[PDB]
Amino acid sequence: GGLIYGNYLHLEKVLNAQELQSETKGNKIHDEHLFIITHQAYELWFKQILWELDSVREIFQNGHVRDERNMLKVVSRMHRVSVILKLLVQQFSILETMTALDFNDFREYLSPASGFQSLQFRLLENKIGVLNFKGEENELLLKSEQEKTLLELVEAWLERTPGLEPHGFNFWGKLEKNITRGLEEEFIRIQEKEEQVAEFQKQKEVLLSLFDEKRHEHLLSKGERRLSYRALQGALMIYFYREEPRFQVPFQLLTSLMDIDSLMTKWRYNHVCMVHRMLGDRYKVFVDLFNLSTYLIPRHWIPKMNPTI
Amino acid sequence: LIYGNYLHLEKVLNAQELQSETKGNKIHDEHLFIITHQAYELWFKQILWELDSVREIFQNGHVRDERNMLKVVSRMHRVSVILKLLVQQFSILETMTALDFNDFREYLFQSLQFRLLENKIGVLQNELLLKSEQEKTLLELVEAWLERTPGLEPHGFNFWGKLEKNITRGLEEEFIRIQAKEESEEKEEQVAEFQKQKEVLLSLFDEKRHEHLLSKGERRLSYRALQGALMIYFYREEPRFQVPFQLLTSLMDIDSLMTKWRYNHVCMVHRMLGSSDRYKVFVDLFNLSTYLIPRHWIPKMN
Amino acid sequence: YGNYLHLEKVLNAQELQSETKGNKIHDEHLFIITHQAYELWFKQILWELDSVREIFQNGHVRDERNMLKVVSRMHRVSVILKLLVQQFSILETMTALDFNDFREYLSPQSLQFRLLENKIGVLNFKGEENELLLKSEQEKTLLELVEAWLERTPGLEPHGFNFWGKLEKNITRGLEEEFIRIQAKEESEEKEEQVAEFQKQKEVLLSLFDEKRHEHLLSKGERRLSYRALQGALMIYFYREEPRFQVPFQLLTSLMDIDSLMTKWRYNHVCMVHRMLGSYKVFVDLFNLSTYLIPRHWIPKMN
Amino acid sequence: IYGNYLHLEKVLNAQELQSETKGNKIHDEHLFIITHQAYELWFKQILWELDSVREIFQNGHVRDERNMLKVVSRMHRVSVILKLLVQQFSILETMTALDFNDFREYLSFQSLQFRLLENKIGVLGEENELLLKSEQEKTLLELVEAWLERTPGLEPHGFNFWGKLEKNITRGLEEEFIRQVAEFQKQKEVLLSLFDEKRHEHLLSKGERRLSYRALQGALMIYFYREEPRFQVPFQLLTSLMDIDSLMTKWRYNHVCMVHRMLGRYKVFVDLFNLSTYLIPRHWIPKMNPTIH
Ligand SMILES: C[C@](N)(Cc1c[nH]c2ccccc12)C(=O)O
Ligand SMILES: C[C@](N)(Cc1c[nH]c2ccccc12)C(=O)O
Ligand SMILES: C[C@](N)(Cc1c[nH]c2ccccc12)C(=O)O
Ligand SMILES: C[C@](N)(Cc1c[nH]c2ccccc12)C(=O)O
C-alpha cells in the first residue's frame, strides 16, 4: 500500500521523456531507444550519487562529522556511492549489445558537442575534487567548482586526527626516529652486496622522502600530491592503528574513498572505450591515500601504543 | 541536438519528489527508493520496446524470412542482458537498512509495465493492460513458428514417427540386454531405471496426456510445437536450426531471469516490511531439454 | 610461481571419465574445472570462517580492537559467495543435451560445503572425512559463538540502562497514545483499517516481551538465538550509530548477507540440477529483529 | 567419485603459505594462493576451449558450416570465463596493502598459461617447450584469416563486392561533390584509404594491422551482409573475437592496477574493430543479386 506508483515515481515525466531523433526526422531507428534509456539511467544514478555525496559533504561542513556517532552514516553512504558506480560500470554491458553498424544508422541524427555533456558527472568530479556552454546549468557547475570538495573536507578532518599531537603520542616524531634508526641498523647489517646496497639506498630515499615537508609542498604545488603534509600524517596514523576502535570506521572511510577513485577511473575508461567502439592518473583525487598504502615501513618500526585512551 | 534536451533530462531528473520532504520530515534514503524504482521502469520500457518489436516480426510474418532470425535472437538476448542488470540492481537497495526504511515507510506498488511484460511474454494469468491480455503473446507467436518447423512433415522426414520407432526399438534392445542379468541385486535396480525411463520416454508420444496437461495448465505449447522444438534441439547443428536453437535457449534464459527478478522482489519486500510457480511460460522447452534420448536413437538426416 | 601455487597438483587434476572410458565429452572438462573452482573457494571460505570462530573461542573478540578483522574477514566471505553465485553463469554455457553426452559416465555432495553449513550453524563419506564432518557437527557454530557475544552486549544490564524495561515501558505508552488517537476522528472505513493495523502491530510489538513464546519457538526451531541475545541484537540495531556498536552492527548485517547468499547458492545449485538432469536461515532472528518496526521517538533515549 | 573424480586430493592439498612454512604464518596469503590457483584453473579451461576451436579450423571441419554453432558457443564461453575472471579481481580487493606488506617478504610471477593464451590467440624447460609450441603453432588470428579469405562473395568473377563498393562509394562522393567541405575531403581520404592495398601491406609489415587485405574484405562482406543466413553465425564469431580482445585487455588493466595497488590498446583483432568504424551509408552497400545464399 502507498500513493499511486506512477504518481509517486512521477513516471508521467520519466516514461514520457523518450524522443528518438530518428522518428522526429522521419527515419525511426530501433537501437536509438536503447541509447536514450541507457544514458537516461546513468543520469538517474548520477543524481543519487550527487545526492549521497552532497549529504556527506554537509556532515563535514556542518561539523557533525566531529560527533563520531555519525561516522557509520558517512561510511554507509560513501560505500553506497561505490556500489552505484559498480552497477554503472556493469551497465556498459547493455550498450555493448549495440552494433557499431546499427549505431551509424542513427549517428547522423546526433550532435557532436554534447557527446559527453553529463553536467551531473562534471558536478560529481568537481564535488569529489577532480583536478562547457551552459546558463543556469553553468551557474550550478560554478557552485560545483566554487564550493568545498570532499577532498578538502576530508583533508581538514584528517589534520584533526588524534595522536599527531607532538606533546602527545608525537606519532610523526616516533616514526621518523624509529625509521631512521632501523635504516641505520640495516646499513650496519650491509657493512649480491652491490644489489642489496642499491635496494637499501632506494628504500632509504623513499622511506625518508616522507619527513621532507619541502618536497611534499613542491609536489603539492606541482599537482603530484593533493593532501596537506599534516593530512598525510592523519592518514598514516589511521592506516597503522586501524585496529584501534576510534580508527576502525575511519580506516573504512579512507578505503571507500580509494574504491570510489578507482571506480570513477574505470567508468571513464569504459566511456572512452565505448566512444572509440561506436565512432572509431591525474584523475585520482585521493592519490595520496593510495601512495600512503604503498609506504612499506616494517611492522617492528611502527610506534608502539602507550596505555593511551 | 544537446545532451539534456536529447535525453529530455528536464523530465527524468525533475521527477524526484520525496513524500517525506513534502509532508515536512525529509528522509535521505527515500531518494534512493525513488531513483532505484524509476530506473527499473526505464529498463522495463526498453524490454517492452524490444519484446513488442520481436512480437511484430512474428505477426507481420517477416519471421518467415530467416534473414530476420539474427535481429530476433539479438533483441531477445538484449532482453536477458537487461534482466541480468536488473537482478544485479537489487544490490543498490540492499544498501538501505530496514530501520532507515521504517523512517519513511509511514509516508508513501505494482509496475503496470512489469504486468504488461508478463502478459506480452505469456504469463498464465486507463487499461493498456487490456491490449496486453488481448493481443498475441510471444509464447503464442513462437508456438505457430514452432508448428511450421521443417522436418515435422509426416509425408517428409516424419521425425516424430522415426523417433517413436527408434525409441521403442532401442528400449526393447535394452530390455533384452537386461533380461539376461541372472536375477542379480543390480538387475532389479537396472529393471526399475528401465521401467521409469520407458514411462517418461514413451510419455512424449501420448498426445492425449499433453492435451489434458495443456487443459490442466501443466504444459503451454501445442503437441506439434513440442515436435518443432525437439526437431530444433536434436538437429541444432543444422544451419537452418543453429540460430533458431539460440532463440529457444534465450526464451528459457528470459524465463529464469524473470523468475529470479520476482524472487529478489519478494525477498526485498520480506527484508523491508517484515512479513516454477507456473511462472515458467516456456516450461515445455526446459522439459524437452530433459528428455535423455541416446544420440544413436535420434533419426539420421540423409 | 607454479611451485609456490603448487600448479603441479592444481593442473594435472583434470580427468574426463569420457576420455578414460574411451569416448570424449569435450564439455566434461568445464564440469571438472567449474566444481574444482567452487571447492578452491569453499576452502578459502572455511579458512576465513574458522579464523573468525577462533577470535570468538580464544576470547580475543572481547578486545573490540579485533572487531575490524572480524567484519573484514566475514565481508570477504560474502564477496567470495557473490563470485560463486556469478560463477553459475559459466555452467549455464553447457547444453543439457551436451551434458547427457557425458552424464552416462557420472554417479550421484561437497564435504567442504556441508562443513561450511555446520560451521555457520545449519540445523555419506570416508572415515577421516567423516572424522572432519564429526568435528563440524561437534564444534561450536558461529551462531553459537555470536549468541554468547550478543548476550554480553552492553546496556542489557537491568541495574544499568535496563534497555528491555525502558523499551516495554515506551512501546506500551506509545501504543496507548495511538489507542487514544483511535476514535479521534469519527469511526470510518479508513479508521477501521487503521484500528486493525494497530491491533495487529500491538500483538507483534508486545510479542517481543513474551520470553515463554521465544523459549517454545527456540525448542520448536522457529528461532535460534537466546532471548538475551535477541536483546543484545536489538540494542546494537537501535543504537548502531553509537561508536562501540557501529562495527558490531556491520558484523550482524554481514551474517545476514552470508545467510541470503548461501540460500541463493543452494537455489542456483537446485535450479542447475533440474536444468541438467531434468524434472532455514541460521540468523533468522536477526532478519526478524530488523522487521520489528518501533518508531524512532519510542527508542529509549541514551541521554 | 566426488573428491576422487575432481582429484581434490591434489587441488585441496596444493596450499602452502610460505609465511607458515618459514614459521611466520600470515592469514591473507591463503587468499593469494587460492585466488591465483582459481585464475589458473579457468585459464586451463580457456586454453582447452580455444585449442578446440583452433583444431576445428586446422582439421578443416570449419568448412562444414554445421560446426559454426559449436565454434561460436565455445568462443562465447571463453568471453563468459574472462568476465568471471575480471569480476574475481573483487576478491583480492578485499586485501589491505598494509596486510599484503606483512607477507610481501615471501615475494620473488607471470602465468605460463596466460602467455600461452596470448600466443594461441595471436598477441603480436618443458614449460619453455610448451611456450615454443605456442609461438610456433598457427594462432586463432591466422586460422580466422584463412577462413575470412575463403568468405563467399569476395570472388571478383562473382559478386566482386570490393569492386561494387569502390564504384558505389566513388559515385556517391561525386554526387556529394555536386551537392563541412573539409569534413567531406577528410571523410573521402579515410573512406577511399580502404582501397589502398599498398598502405595495408605496409601497415601489416609495420604491425599496425594483422589481417590480410582479402581477409579485411571477407570481414566487411560478413559485417554488411550479416542479416544473410550463412553470415548470421559468422558475424557472431567476429563480434565474439572482438569481445574476447577487450576482456583480455580489461584483465591486463586490472592485473596492472592491482600490482600498483598492492606493491606501489593493441588488440589481436584491431582490424575487425577498425572495419566496424568505416561508416559506409546503407544506400551505398552493394545490393544482393537474385543469387543470395
Ligand atoms: C573529534 C573528532 N571526530 C576527532 C577526529 C578527527 N579526525 C579523526 C580521524 C580519526 C579518528 C578521530 C578523528 C574531530 O575532531 O572531528
Ligand atoms: C519459413 C519459416 N521461417 C520456416 C520455419 C518455421 N519454423 C522454423 C523453425 C526453425 C527453422 C525454420 C522454421 C516459416 O514457416 O516461418
Ligand atoms: C568486551 C566485549 N567485546 C563487549 C561486547 C560483547 N558483545 C558486544 C556487542 C557489541 C559491542 C560490544 C560487545 C565482550 O564482552 O567480549
Ligand atoms: C565453406 C566455408 N565455410 C566458406 C566460408 C569461409 N568463410 C566464411 C564466412 C562466412 C560464411 C561462409 C564462409 C569455408 O571456406 O570453410
| Domains identified in chain D, total number | 1
Residue of D nearest to B240 (CA): D229
Q: How far is CA A76 from CA A64, A161, B29, B55, D173, in A?
A: 16, 20, 11, 44, 58
Q: Which residues of D touch A255 (CB under 8 A)?
A: 96
Q: How far is CA A21 from CA A119, B16, C165, in A?
A: 21, 26, 65
Determine the distance separating the centroid of ligand 2 and the alpha carbon of D293, expressed in angstroms: 16
Q: Which residues of B touch C95 (CB under 8 A)?
A: 249, 289
SS3 content of chain B, % helix, strand, coil (to 5): 70, 0, 30
Q: Do A69 and C241 touch (CB under 8 A)?
A: yes
Closest CA to C293 of C190, C169, C202: C202
Burial class (CB in 10 A: 0-12, 13-18, 19+), B89: buried
Tell me chain D's radius of gyration from C-alpha atoms.
24
Q: Which of D70, D72, D151, D212 gets mutated to test ligand 4 (max ligand atoms within 8 A of its CB)?
A: D151
Q: Which residues of A254-275 are buried (b: 16+ CB within 10 A; e: fewer)?
A: bbbbbbbbbbbebbebbbebee
The string of DSSP codes covering chain A is --S-HHHHTTHHHHTT----HHHHHS---TTHHHHHHHHHHHHHHHHHHHHHHHHHHHHHHTSGGGSGGGHHHHHHHHHHHHHHHHHHHHHHHHHTTS-HHHHHHHHTTS-STTSS--HHHHHHHHHHT-----SHHHHHHHHHHHSPPHHHHHHHHHHT-TT--TTTT-HHHHHHHHHHHHHHHHHHHH--HHHHHHHHHHHHHHHHHTT-HHHHHHHHHHTS--S-HHHHHHHHHHHHTTTSHHHHHHHHHHHHHHHHHHHHHHHHHHHHHHHHHH---TT-TTHHHHHHHH----GGGSPPP-S--
- Asked whether residue A94 is domain-assigned, the answer is yes
3-state class (DSSP) for residue B248: helix
| Residues contacting A225, CB < 8 A, separation 6+ | A216, A219, A287, A288, A291
What residues flank ligand 2, with Cβ below 6 Å? Answer: B 63-64, 66, 145, 148-150, 232, 240-241, 244
Residues of C with CB under 8 A from a CB of B: 92, 95-97, 100-101, 103, 237-238, 240, 253, 257, 260, 267, 271, 274-275, 277-279, 287-288, 290-293, 295-296
- Asked whether residue B27 is domain-assigned, the answer is yes
Same domain, B210 and B265: yes
Task: Determine whether the shortest distance from the Cβ of C152 to ligand 3 is under 6 A.
Answer: yes
What residues flank ligand 4, with Cβ below 6 Å? Answer: D 62-63, 65, 147, 150-152, 222, 230-231, 234
Spatial contact of B34 and A145, defined as CB atoms under 8 Å apart: no
Q: What is the 3-state secondary structure (H, E, C) of B143-209?
A: HHHHHCCCCCCCCCCCHHHHHHHHHHHHHHHHHHHHHCCCCCHHHHHHHHHHHHHHHHHHHCCCHHH
Q: Which residues of C touch A73 (CB under 8 A)?
A: 241
- Asked whether residue B269 is domain-assigned, the answer is yes
- Asked whether residue D202 is domain-assigned, the answer is yes
Q: Do D14 and C26 touch (CB under 8 A)?
A: no
- Each as own residue / partner, the long-range contacts of residues B49-56 (CB below 8 Å, 24 or more positions apart, any chain) are B49/A33, B50/B75, B50/B76, B50/B78, B50/B79, B50/B82, B51/B79, B51/B117, B51/B120, B51/B121, B51/B138, B52/B120, B53/A30, B54/B138, B55/B120, B55/B135, B55/B136, B55/B138, B55/B141
Determine the distance separating the centroid of ligand 1 and the alpha carbon of A276, expressed in angstroms: 45
Same domain, B67 and B132: yes
Residue D58 CA to residue D4 CA, distance in Å, equals 35
Residue C161 CA to residue A245 CA, distance in Å, equals 23
Q: Which residues of A234-245 are buried (b: 16+ CB within 10 A; e: fewer)?
A: bbbbbbbbbbbb
Is A188 annotated to bind a ligand? Reply is no
Instruction: Classify the C-alpha dihedral D34-D40-D41-D42 as positive or negative.
Output: positive
Q: Which residues of C touch D87 (CB under 8 A)?
A: 83, 86
The residue out of B205, B220, B240 marking a domain boundary is: B205
Q: Which residues of D touch A296 (CB under 8 A)?
A: 101, 104, 264
Partner residue opposite D273 with nearest CB, options A242, A280, A299: A280
Partner residue opposite C33 with nearest CB, options D44, D90, D94: D44
Q: What domain range includes position A117?
A: 5-166+222-301
Tell me chain C's radius of gyration from C-alpha atoms.
25
- Asked whether residue A187 is domain-assigned, the answer is no
Closest residue (by CA) to atom 7 of ligand 4?
Answer: D151
Residue of B nearest to C97 (CA): B289
Lookup: cell for A309: 585512551
Q: Which of B58, B66, B241 gets mutated to test ligand 2 (max ligand atoms within 8 A of its CB)?
A: B66
Q: Which one of D24, D98, D180 makes the best mutation probe of the A interface by having the most chain A beta carbons within 10 Å?
A: D98
With contact defined as 3+ CB pairs under 8 Å, the chains touching C are: A, B, D
Tell me chain A's radius of gyration from C-alpha atoms.
25
Atom of ligand 1 nearest to the CA of A246: 11
Phi and psi at residue A173, in whole multiples of 5°? -50, -60
Atom of ligand 4 nearest to the CA of D68: 3
- Asked whether residue D181 is domain-assigned, the answer is no
Residue B86 CA to residue A172 CA, distance in Å, equals 49
Is A39 annotated to bind a ligand? Reply is yes
Same domain, B178 and B83: no
3-state class (DSSP) for residue D138: coil
Partner residue opposite B243 with nearest CB, options D66, D70, D232: D232
Atom of ligand 3 nearest to the CA of C150: 7
Residue A64 CA to residue A82 CA, distance in Å, equals 23
**What determination technique applies here?**
X-ray
Residue A158 CA to residue C289 CA, distance in Å, equals 36
* A-B C-beta contacts closer than 8 Å: 148
Determine the distance separating the centroid of ligand 4 and the alpha carbon of D159, expressed in angstroms: 15
Q: Which residues of C touch D44 (CB under 8 A)?
A: 11, 14, 33
Is A36 annotated to bind a ligand? Reply is yes
- Asked whether residue A233 is domain-assigned, the answer is yes
Q: Do A44 and B38 touch (CB under 8 A)?
A: yes
Spatial contact of B85 and A97, defined as CB atoms under 8 Å apart: no
Q: Do A245 and C243 touch (CB under 8 A)?
A: yes
- Asked whether residue C205 is domain-assigned, the answer is no
Closest CA to B79 of B201, B255, B237, B216: B255
**What Å resolution does this PDB entry report?**
3.2
SS3 content of chain D, % helix, strand, coil (to 5): 70, 0, 30
Find the CATH number of the domain harbouring D71.
1.20.58.480
Q: What H or E segment, with its residue span, contains residue B141?
A: helix B138-147
Spatial contact of C240 and A72, defined as CB atoms under 8 Å apart: yes
Q: Do A242 and C68 touch (CB under 8 A)?
A: yes
Q: At what angle do helices B239-273 and B98-105 cross, to 10 degrees?
A: 70
Q: How far is CA D224 from CA D97, D159, D219, D232, D286, in A?
A: 50, 14, 9, 11, 9
Determine the distance separating the centroid of ligand 3 and the alpha carbon of A69, expressed in angstroms: 18
Same domain, B38 and B84: yes
* Closest Cα in chain A, distance from residue C137 (Å): 32
Q: What is the 3-state secondary structure (H, E, C) of chain C?
A: CCCCCCHHHHCCCCCCHHHHHCCCCCCHHHHHHHHHHHHHHHHHHHHHHHHHHHHHHCCHHHCHHHHHHHHHHHHHHHHHHHHHHHHHHHHCCCCHHHHHHHHCCCCCCCHHHHHHHHHHCCCCCCHHHHHHHHHHHHCCCHHHHHHHHHHCCCCCCCCCCCHHHHHHHHHHHHHHHHHHHCCCCCCCHHHHHHHHHHHHHHHHHHHCCCHHHHHHHHHHCCCCCCHHHHHHHHHHHHCCCCHHHHHHHHHHHHHHHHHHHHHHHHHHHHHHHHHHHCCCCCCHHHHHHHHCCCCHHHCCCCC
Same domain, B35 and B180: no
Closest CA to D242 of D273, D214, D217, D202: D273
Same domain, B274 and B188: no
Task: Determine whether the shortest distance from the Cβ of C64 to ligand 3 is under 6 A.
Answer: yes
